[model samples]
Target: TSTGRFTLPSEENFAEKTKELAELWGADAIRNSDGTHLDEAVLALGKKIYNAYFPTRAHNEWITLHMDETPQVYLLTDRILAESDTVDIPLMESFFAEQLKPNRDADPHKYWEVVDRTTGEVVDSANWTLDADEDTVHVSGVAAWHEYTVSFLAYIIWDPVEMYNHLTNDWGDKEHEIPFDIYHPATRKFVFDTFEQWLKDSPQTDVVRFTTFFYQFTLLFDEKRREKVVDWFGCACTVSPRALDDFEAKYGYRLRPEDFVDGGAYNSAWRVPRKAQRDWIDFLSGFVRENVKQLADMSHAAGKEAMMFLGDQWIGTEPYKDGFDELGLDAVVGSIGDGTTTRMIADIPGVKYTEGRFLPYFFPDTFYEGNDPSIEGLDNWRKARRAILRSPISRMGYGGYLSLAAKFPKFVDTVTHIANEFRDIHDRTGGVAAEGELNVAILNSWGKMRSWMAFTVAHALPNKQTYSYYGILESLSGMRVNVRFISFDDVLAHGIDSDIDVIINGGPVDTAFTGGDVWTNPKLVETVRAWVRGGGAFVGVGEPSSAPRFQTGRFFQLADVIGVDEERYQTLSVDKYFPPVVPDHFITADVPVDPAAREAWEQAGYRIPLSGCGGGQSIKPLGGIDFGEPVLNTYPVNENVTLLRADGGQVQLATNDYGKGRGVYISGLPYSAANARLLERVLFYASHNEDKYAAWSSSNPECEVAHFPEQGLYCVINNTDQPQKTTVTLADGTTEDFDLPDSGIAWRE
Candidate 1:
């Protein structure tokens, strides 16, 4: 009956502080976190209290025992093989945060390997040995005057956080921090041994949250600690020569350093998979899936359920990819920030259940000094509540030190109210689906897996400051449309198999969201084009199909399909005349306008002042297009195409009809109240349902409405600062007025 609102482990004195907050908040459980210093006295008392409330799912005993990446002095170096009789590989990296975690008691040869660069072979164990205190591998028997690479797995002198702390903080551990290669067998054995020991030591743990295994997103800075570095798609640059050697074995292609764009530190670990990198991603995904499945299976065998935190060390476990569910995870929890984010964590397919940890993380930066703990905490809940109404997760909780929260009593009260509110709504419409008129397919590389994770600049949580630009996702997360994620590969393989009404591809240019090299494949483009021609609406935002750098032969591959073309530097000499906006169109209905701007357009015979999509950033129209069939100097430009005007006016939004289908293009549209209304219109117009749009129309542009036919429910929520009233259409095509409180949801049956 109660939502799980557990606080991070409490530490030291005043056992009453824990009980006081837990009773007021109806503490379902207590989650132990880093730096939690509690005594047996408090632990026993907490367990007693936890058993009193929820005996059926008794997990108050769960303790976070992170058995990932053990400390190791791996023989790491960037130097490739050069002319040498004996490959004198360096025993230590001088620049690596200077703290030694040496293996004086263990056999260094077991964890070390000698790699031949030219041959792409790992020197046989019989050929090399840890020579002279294991400083370097004696590989003269293996190679004669040939370039070679050597890598090893050793323990770190200090933990990663300790190393970071010592490097940054005045009071910190001054030891070398080493990263383990999760790909290595030696590392795997070490992790298993360590985990077995951890399980034996912590007898109270009922659920094992694998604080993730290996490879978190790249947190590397340049050699000088300036400029955050990654390979194109913000993937962390962390590839060991060991990994490289194994890559060839799995993918059957010897990956030269140049293959992954100079593999040393700039490996393309995160870039969207291109034709060239397809095999590599396949290999990586396959390897990660197998390893993760093993680790999770091990957890289950130990009589405990395994859950995965969706951040940090969550890199290799592609949550949105095909192999994720195979990991056999019991549950998944992510940091919740907004509606889009709420759906991102909750919608992770194949997981039995999902949970979200709300924000203003109990950190000193966000909690103490200047920031108001109560207001920030309340604001996070208020935003989270709107999203919860759309799709509610099974449970909700928070992270970080609860001690910080204890400092502010008012903050605790606010959390109590928020948790109760979450429980009430979650109980009412948690599993119910909103009735969808049209099944909207969102096409991208990630597709179904990373559905609501799109439409953001930087990959982050949805805070008010950075949340505005990702409006399309926010609108759709709680909208009535049945959204489905589709990869270009899906279209290429099956050709729009589902009953998809409208296909939306939106993101910056050359990214996965735009289909990157997948667009270059004629089969992929033709399939989508063919599907659209068969009466499916295709809506594109930003550079949906424009200037694919890798495949420029047919720039804007879907230009014919969308009827909008971007004239970039390559198309400068085309000398094609273009036209402008067609006035009083259905897509731009009720598009607010300045009177001066409108009058000037009317005065100039309705030719100038293109009515751009509203809200956020203005459109950066880089040239224009000629809409079919117009009256001005209609000269045939290129066969079927004709010039409506002599010069370019930077076409803002254009609609086209190809065969039985329709296409709509917008330069760009970030999420906002005005833009939300415009987007609703765009979807309707693109689907040839413009006349039907007013059926479910909302008078208040700031308010969003969703209909759930399955539950016979309709929800209209004011996702804005001010109160809103709107008229929403029900399943029967009947309309009624609904008053919505600011940041509130009004449900109707």
Candidate 2:
């Protein structure tokens, strides 16, 4: 069988089958529960007449078994439907009325057998044979062999000779002689009777195979949607299926056809005949769509998304098989041979449905369709240039075979692509407010199809050994938000969930203070007071509690909350080695409350460190912002009991009775994954602060999101690192910029 092509029956074949099936399935079909003797008249005129049409040709090959527990015989018809012309929906007609013959009866399926590599291991056994009930059988044993799953083994159970014998003998024994071909006076010599002659033709509705594979796997993860499943086989590695076995054992999941072993696998198609093909597509589609990188409480707007794969093929792939390097083809590592050239891109398919004018082939696995998407065969610079020009895009997802997750390099490369290309979205379009139309290319990564990608890709960065060499990068990059270099003791003492804000000293805010007076700083005290009184929520870091003697200042209240209260929160307190920086409690790869936050920081070269991103506690810069020496300082800040709390590793950041608005910012984190715990606390506290919900009206919807019945207002800075020149129409019909930064975000408006 051709990989991408499928076979279907012609109209004549359908008409003949329809007549034979109708008579066999009349009310009598249901009456004959047991496959018993056939009725003579029914057999002679109907079964015998139709027997010639059965299996007219056996062109397709494959052991297909539609082993439905509620086995319903099916006939085929294919034609365009009004619902959707592009989509193909097969027409199925059922004709079985009752029993045919006992010899052919495989009913009352009492016992079943399982044959797999994992046999006899508790899992390979079945409970008992299934019972043959009316119309349906409920068989529950072994690897789900009844309706949904059993259908895949269609070719195995089909026997034409057996069918003919059962038809004749079973009917004879049942007290009925098969009817002869009836001849009508009006018609010529050998005119067979049809149901139409008795009753007017009617659109029949028979129970289709109970398996609902159509709905399950077809929507999101179907290989048809992806267009292809290219298994990239490059520099073939010789390893046992140890990885596959280990994978199944470790995660309780099975490895399928496209699964790479020794670096090779490529099998997927948009349309195929077997029910298994449908199931596989359904399975893959679901698997791919599910692998999206899920950010906590972050959905479509966030950069977090599923996996997508896109690549080109090699010349040795095959003459007409332009898969490798074609528009959409599936390839494996070795399949590329010496001629294949594989490239990678980080693209997250948009979760929201998109409508455009471009022709969308079921996303094929390879670039083999003789069409070059903007990036198909471009040079690195051109690819990068396109990245810059494309409009800012919400991460769509990863898709295709040899996914971004296939290798570490590919994964990292994709990440870099996402990060770098993201910023370009803004630059190319000259920001959202900038004029001129923008070209937007979305990456569909189907990584999320399988469950593993969710966890693996999510933690890769935060769990890394290092992020920044010099602590300066961590402080300025804004990747890690404003943090306080605090001691564990005061963190517990002063940090409480009552306060509307957190105060970061930046060096050390112990009982002893030095250098400058923190209470007098207007930005510090006023910002805090306004936050408390104006109901604005946030964290306030006054002058760092500088100990001129130790030349240090630390987080006053934000500390100790994440277990960094005492001189040492854990053995890794801000690098026990480098007494300057502090460590973070949680980690994440999500963007901050503001998308442009990263760009602003990057533009200014602002960075931060958790005692160590890369150089962890090994280096030190002992001084203040401008001063080469540490200035002495102390904090006499408002100590609200209900607003903020920090102690015993359990802490919440907020403000008590701070006017009506709660603008208390959690100084704990903005982006760095190590600070994930801090973000969770902040998000949890922020989202749930106001118990009774209230209605809200946003000044705009495009640039703003207002939750009615909650009065929660959020500003989204979807500044994808790409240039997006589009006006965001507000609920009030006003347009604003919807540009994105290198990173993406949605925060308090």
Candidate 3:
């Protein structure tokens, strides 16, 4: 079997490309047709769709059939043009002198050339468009080729409608169709159609339909062009794209490619080669649990923002409170540590502790010996850590986890070893399933980020990133984070109820853990192949932190997703890098960053990482774009899921996918203070994913509740700040608003 390695324009894979395509349902969904070669189908469809785009007479064969013996292809890769009327061509760059047919480079005399050395064919022609017609025009490098069957179309932000509109806007003669001749390989004729026909009825006119065809998407600009094209071809209507709901009903496919991410890449989208003998990818993919949801909730509701606040709290200790204004968080969220949350049920009024999710938790601080605050006290802390580690009931320690996990394999043995004493403890507590009940567990490891605490890889191995005993004690001083756990009476039940769940347990299965791209997390691979696998996220050595650029190979898969070159991250050696504490102006500071943190950062020498997550069409409200300057407003918000608690509509975002007993999500970055506040906003987003205790809110109208095992759990919020009010139109149409307090929030459950 061969891994599909199709080229950009190879005819051999046409069938595969056309097979995977269908209409888009909306921005976030697509019809998930199982057991099909999705990649092959889509690319196969791309060509067919591009062909259907001729806007000419209906065709029988593929539109590209109009290929000429000496086909003249234009490119849009932004290659520069030679001054001499030397038409450039693809495939044959050598024997350049033989292909050259130089001429004047003046207006109306640009060069177009095709050199097929194998055939000794050189059609040096003068046909490049150094400029466009003066008429109103909005042709793109891509659209032009689709329209003319002429490749090599260059892209310039020209508005075809604006030009054509102004040109004919004032015309009083008659509503005559604008004339044009577009090449349609399908029709094999210079298929001529009035601009009106294209603007109105052409299949390419439908936004949803248009996006299905990659060529069309590449050509789309702003809404104006889209609407203008539709309005221009007022009489044409064959291309009316399926309505959102209708689309879902008919083809059962969603149009958005999970915004090009969910499908394009997930866990292993990029490959990260580690020096370790064991495939590091396996290990990283298998460990997931790290956060104490309850504590995170308290910090989020009490702190300024979730991102920086929680992330920083790992380094700084603060009491659990309800004022995250300092973090610029419209909302803050946590995964499992419900006990640490500051929110409470307002309507209930007097519940000392109202919990939502009681998630499983772990403790990683047990393996170390030299924790400062515990200096001589290390022995005591070690004993305590060990006690917790050995327990199978519900532990909050690290060593036991690594040991138990080792029972499986080295790569991703997140939990193979356990102390026998601890196993007994589990049965004593309500943490273990009875003799035969079903069992399900989620392993998280966000705390592994502390692994960076070491200066080099040697000091911070896979299991080393832990806190000092005193540090943990200090963090526990004011408010504490709780880990999550639950119990069942029958482990045997899982065999039937969710037999698939056992696949991820990997009991003795040794799955290799090579560093893979987002397209290949080991868990993902296992899930896809064996149909079951679960682990949490891990911090790769490549995380954008203090690691030397060169040393930061495939650590966090950061370089893979960033997609930019090394030069992009190189410091000026003169000033701090961007997304910096004080990046240049034009960049309005969204939050009050800790100046000390900033100085400490630059002094210690570190910078923020940029993303290559954008190109052609991304839905970000503000284009986290970088052209040395911010260019456009980013629509950072996505549609809210039904149960999400929103503030200023910014604090929450969700993946919006829910079903039987499986879920997957990442709450951007942790909500912490040590990190830039910019690093803390994701907690609010994480909270939106709660489904378990959503019903708990129905009985308590004035409260918002969420839970993740034993981690974070809360049910109420107080937003009495300056007449704060937003209608929560329930499933029954009744709307209610909460009067918030100026201090920020008084949460209860």
**What are the TM-scores, per candidate, against the unseen true structure?**
0.75, 0.20, 0.20
* Better lDDT candidate (1, 2): 1
lDDT for 633 (candidate 1): 18
Q: Each model's RMSD to truth, in Å?
A: 8.6, 27.2, 29.3
lDDT of 1 by residue, 182-208 (tens): 566655565566666666655555566
TM-score of candidate 2 against the unseen true structure: 0.20
Candidate with better lDDT, 1 vs 3: 1
Q: Give the top-scoring candidate (lDDT).
A: 1
Q: Please give the lDDT score for candidate 1.
A: 0.58
Which portions of model 1 show Cα errors greater than 4 Å? 1-9, 35-177, 230-238, 261-272, 275-277, 449-458, 461-471, 547-554, 569-580, 604-648, 691-697
TM-score of 3: 0.20
Among all windows of 10 consecutive residues in model 2, the one with the lowest summed lDDT is 334-343
After aligning candidate 2 to the native by TM-score, how far in Å is the CA of 713 from where it should be? Answer: 28
- Number of clashes in every candidate structure? 16, 186, 164
